[PDB]
């Protein structure tokens, strides 16, 4: 039982085009006009099957790569993380590799983090929000704090000194400068692509070059950072990581967070400041108002369940990553239908999070809601490939919120909360809507 196919009106580009303008509405359209939402868009002549049903998510996450591999679809990353580094490494290694990062971003590895990140914020604002009140772009400053903060946590002083955040940021940016989201048909498209790499690849090298130097430098003198920790790692056979792979994993760490976290932090501030949500804002404050000026792990990790709620909804309502794809290397059965081998198969947070059965009044941002279908919230993916940085991210967000709101109040210079800008790789509030006003308490 092949799933319905939205008929293709213009031979080569219509869906890719139609999705670009309004994917949510587009996708829903197929759900709507084919009745049963396990449809199959065609993108480039690639049959693409979207699993639109919360109930049948489980089928999307669970099958192991040898049945549903992202290695094929995410190939575009390969210049960035490095040849053989991640999805470009056979699954024993990839799994091994990913597993090592995860172990660096575990809640154990956070003992000292909160003040570090809490610092950078108090530092940043003070430096960029001098006046009692002023006007700033929110997206950007969240963007600056996110990056800034991560570095404070995940990188050592020598290292931080040798390559400061701003430079990283530019470094990182050059790397997406490469990226082209063909992922839906992306794999095949790789014929002789222009060195979109050329800009980035240089960037990877410069990072690596640096990374070596600290290692060389550090060892001379006589250490627990992200770099330090990855080096200690050993594969199951018993080989260590090659700084090439080390450099890649670090890139992954900075890469995943940069937009998703920024967008998340931002939305969350955006919704909380808005006047509709006074109620929620007051709730937060009771939560955070007795927190000691100095902030420590426990306040954030343990004593902030609501705030977490707020972040999760923000992601739930407008998730940064619109969808997830796997390459079907074997025929598999989703509910009634069956999906061909060789059909790229995708699952979308953006859609499932607006299925009205599981998220009714999806556009209402309620931090206190709870999914009415399990695994409907997939903002951080699910099953095998669960996000491995989410705990870290949340940590970042919840701290920025407590710190910012605690000493500031914000006024949204737009009548309504912004509109999502879908014209980006990772989807966020529109940069222009984001103007926002701040008043030192």
Ligand X SMILES: O=C(N[C@H](Cc1c[nH]c2ccccc12)C(=O)Nc1ccncc1)c1ccc(-c2cccc(F)c2)cc1F
382 belongs to the binding site for ligand X (CB under 6 A)? no
**Cβ contacts of 239 within 8 Å, gap of 6 or more:** none
User: 3-state DSSP call for residue 42?
Assistant: strand
Which one of ligand HEM, ligand X, none is in contact with 315 (Cβ closer than 5 to 8 A by kind)?
Answer: ligand HEM
181 belongs to the binding site for ligand X (CB under 6 A)? yes
Binding mask 254-293 for ligand X (x = CB under 6 A): -xx---x---------------------------------
Helix axes 14-21, 23-33, angle to 10 degrees: 120
Determine contact, residues 37/31, Cβ cutoff 8 Å.
yes
226 belongs to the binding site for ligand X (CB under 6 A)? no
Which one of ligand X, ligand HEM, none is in contact with 379 (Cβ closer than 5 to 8 A by kind)?
Answer: ligand HEM
Q: Which two tokens stand for residue 144?
A: 């600056």
Which one of ligand HEM, ligand X, none is in contact with 101 (Cβ closer than 5 to 8 A by kind)?
Answer: ligand HEM
Which residue number, 323 or 339, has a Cβ lying nearer to ligand X?
A: 323
434 by Cβ neighbours in 10 Å (0-12 / 13-18 / 19+) ranks as: buried
Which residue number, 253 or 307, has a Cβ lying nearer to ligand HEM?
A: 253
The radius of gyration of the chain from alpha carbons, rounded to an integer in Å, stands at: 22
Q: Which two tokens stand for residue 272?
A: 């909380």
User: 3-state DSSP call for residue 385?
Assistant: coil
User: What is the spatial distance between Cα 379 and Cα 429, in angstroms, rounded to a whole number?
Assistant: 16
344 belongs to the binding site for ligand X (CB under 6 A)? no
Which one of ligand HEM, ligand X, none is in contact with 54 (Cβ closer than 5 to 8 A by kind)?
Answer: none
Which one of ligand HEM, ligand X, none is in contact with 269 (Cβ closer than 5 to 8 A by kind)?
Answer: none
Which residue number, 307 or 324, has a Cβ lying nearer to ligand X?
A: 324
Least Å distance between CB 323 and ligand X? Answer: 4
Contact set with ligand HEM (CB under 6 A): 70, 98, 101, 252-253, 256-257, 260-261, 264, 315, 320-321, 324, 379-381, 385, 387-390, 392-393
Residue bearing tokens 């929620």: 280
Which residue number, 299 or 348, has a Cβ lying nearer to ligand X?
A: 348
Which one of ligand X, ligand HEM, none is in contact with 390 (Cβ closer than 5 to 8 A by kind)?
Answer: ligand HEM
321 belongs to the binding site for ligand X (CB under 6 A)? yes
**Cβ contacts of 198 within 8 Å, gap of 6 or more:** none
Which one of ligand HEM, ligand X, none is in contact with 187 (Cβ closer than 5 to 8 A by kind)?
Answer: none
Q: Which two tokens stand for residue 123?
A: 């530092």
How far apart, in Å, are the Cα atoms of 168 and each of 44, 208, 298, 364, 394?
35, 12, 30, 37, 22
Which residue number, 29 or 95, has a Cβ lying nearer to ligand HEM?
A: 95
Spell out a b/e string for 188-206, using b for 16 or more CB atoms within 10 Å of the CB, else e.
eeeeeeeebbeebbebbee
Asked if residue 347 belongs to a known ligand binding site, the reply is: no
Which residue number, 129 or 248, has a Cβ lying nearer to ligand HEM?
A: 248
User: What is the spatial distance between Cα 90 and Cα 88, in angstroms, rounded to a whole number?
Assistant: 7
425 belongs to the binding site for ligand X (CB under 6 A)? yes
Residue bearing tokens 């969808």: 323
Q: Using CB under 6 A, which of the segments 122-130, 176-184, 262-270, 354-362 binds ligand X?
A: 176-184
Among 306, 315, 247, which residue's Cα sits nearest to residue 279? 306
Q: Which two tokens stand for residue 7?
A: 């008929």
402 belongs to the binding site for ligand X (CB under 6 A)? no
Please select the residue that binds ligand X; options are 27, 41, 77, 382, rule is CB under 6 A.
77
Determine contact, residues 15/41, Cβ cutoff 8 Å.
yes
Q: Which H helix or E strand runs over 327?
A: strand 324-328
Least Å distance between CB 358 and ligand HEM? Answer: 16
203 belongs to the binding site for ligand X (CB under 6 A)? no
Least Å distance between CB 36 and ligand HEM? Answer: 23
Which one of ligand HEM, ligand X, none is in contact with 425 (Cβ closer than 5 to 8 A by kind)?
Answer: ligand X
**Cβ contacts of 313 within 8 Å, gap of 6 or more:** 271, 365, 366, 367, 369
Q: Which residues are annotated as a binding site for heme?
A: 387
- Binding footprint of ligand X on the chain (CB under 6 A): 74, 77, 181, 183-184, 252, 255-256, 260, 321-323, 387, 425-426
């Amino acid at each position: 039982k092949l799933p319905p196919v939205y008929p293709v009106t213009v031979p080569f580009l219509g869906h890719i085009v139609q999705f670009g303008k309004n994917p949510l509405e587009f996708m829903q359209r197929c759900k709507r006009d084919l009745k049963s939402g396990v449809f199959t868009i065609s993108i480039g002549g690639q049959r693409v099957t979207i699993v639109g049903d919360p109930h049948e998510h489980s089928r999307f996450f669970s099958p192991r790569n040898e049945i549903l591999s992202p290695r094929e679809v995410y190939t575009i990353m390969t210049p960035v993380f490095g040849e053989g580094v991640a999805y470009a490494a056979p699954y024993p290694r990839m799994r091994e590799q990913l597993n090592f990062l995860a172990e660096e971003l575990t809640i154990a590895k956070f003992q000292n983090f909160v003040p570090a990140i809490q610092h950078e914020v108090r530092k940043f604002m003070a430096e960029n929000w001098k006046e009692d009140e002023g006007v700033i772009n929110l997206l950007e400053d969240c963007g600056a704090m996110i990056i800034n903060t991560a570095c404070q946590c995940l990188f050592g002083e020598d290292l931080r000194k040798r390559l400061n955040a701003r430079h990283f940021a530019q470094l990182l940016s050059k790397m997406e400068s490469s990226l082209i989201p063909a992922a839906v048909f992306m794999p095949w498209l790789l014929r002789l692509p222009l060195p979109q790499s050329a800009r980035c690849r240089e960037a990877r090298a410069e990072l690596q070059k640096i990374l070596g130097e600290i290692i060389v430098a550090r060892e001379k003198e006589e250490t627990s950072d992200l770099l330090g920790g990855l080096l200690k790692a050993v594969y199951r056979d018993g080989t260590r990581m090659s700084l090439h792979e080390v450099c890649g994993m670090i890139v992954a760490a900075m890469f995943a967070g940069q937009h998703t976290s920024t967008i998340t932090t931002s939305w969350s501030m955006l919704h909380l400041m808005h006047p509709k949500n006074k109620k929620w804002l007051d709730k937060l404050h009771k939560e955070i108002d007795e927190f000691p000026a100095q902030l420590n792990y426990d306040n954030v990790m343990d004593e902030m369940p609501f705030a977490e709620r707020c972040v999760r909804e923000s992601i739930r309502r407008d998730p940064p990553l619109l969808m997830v794809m796997r390459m079907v290397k074997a025929e598999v059965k989703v509910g009634s239908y069956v999906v061909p081998k060789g059909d790229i198969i995708a699952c979308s947070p953006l859609l499932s999070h607006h299925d009205e059965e599981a998220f009714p009044n999806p556009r209402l941002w309620d931090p206190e809601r709870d999914e009415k279908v399990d695994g409907a919230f997939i903002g951080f993916g699910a099953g095998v490939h669960k996000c491995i940085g989410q705990k870290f991210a949340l940590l970042q967000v919840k701290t920025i919120l407590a710190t910012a709101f605690r000493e500031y109040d914000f006024q949204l210079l737009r009548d309504e909360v912004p509109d999502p800008d879908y014209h980006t790789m990772v989807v966020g509030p529109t940069l222009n809507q984001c103007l926002v006003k701040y008043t030192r308490k």
